[PDB]
Design a protein around this motif. Structure first.
Motif: not given
Length: 227
Positions: A46-47, A202-207, A209-215
């Protein structure tokens, strides 16, 4: 190595990064786990300071090579685990072709059952309209070969590799990484023959998560020494 025994199972990870790129300050926190038996990392970042001023893929290499899978015949060449639990300092300069550079310094070590990676990053001489500050990199990640050689007089290793970042228009942004690792402790470490690590991520997103982030899901395997 004795350090190797610390990675036989799933190990929790914490990552902390303070960055400043062209004077734009930010901070990132990550947590997850590594399973060195499979060379596998699963982490979410998370940022915490707001919007990230650079693209997430430019921070992947900065944000724990002690989780690489070393095959049995190569276990004597695993510097990274051999330095644990006391850990190592990992320094890089990353030169983005036709653009600015990152300088990073990190300490990677065990604190109890957790592998921590704490990092300070400074970016300079980036172009305001470049692919980094201009956020023109695609949200994905390629597969790389990380070359490792001994640096005996510093009781550590030198590492170099280039990463390839897809640009929205179909071109590729190159980033040359030059890296040095030194043990934090005074005890003996494994100084390796020349070899490399294969990476793929592999980069993805947490559906949710509202903060700027990287899974992030990543696999790292040592090779380059014949069986």
């Amino acid at each position: 190595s004795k350090g190797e025994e610390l990675f036989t199972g799933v190990v929790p990870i914490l990552v902390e990064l303070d960055g400043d790129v062209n004077g734009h300050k930010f901070s990132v926190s990550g947590e997850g786990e590594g399973d060195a038996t499979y060379g596998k990392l699963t982490l979410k970042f998370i940022c915490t300071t707001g919007k990230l001023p650079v693209p997430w893929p430019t921070l992947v290499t900065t944000l724990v090579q002690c989780f690489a899978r070393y095959p049995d015949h190569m276990k004597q060449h695993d510097f990274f685990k051999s330095a644990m639990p006391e850990g190592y300092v990992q320094e890089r300069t990353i030169f983005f072709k036709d653009d600015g550079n990152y300088k990073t310094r990190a300490e990677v070590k065990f604190e109890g059952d957790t592998l921590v990676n704490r990092i300070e990053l400074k970016g300079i001489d980036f172009k305001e309209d470049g692919n980094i500050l201009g956020h023109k990199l695609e949200y994905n990640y390629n597969h790389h070969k990380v070359y490792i050689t001994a640096d005996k007089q510093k009781n550590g290793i030198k590492v170099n590799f280039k990463t390839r970042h897809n640009i929205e228009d179909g071109s590729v942004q190159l980033a040359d990484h030059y890296q040095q690792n030194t043990p934090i402790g005074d005890g003996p470490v494994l100084l390796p023959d020349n070899h490399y690590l294969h990476t793929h991520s592999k980069l993805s997103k947490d559906p949710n998560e509202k903060r700027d982030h990287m899974v992030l899901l990543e696999f790292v395997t040592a090779a380059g020494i014949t069986l």
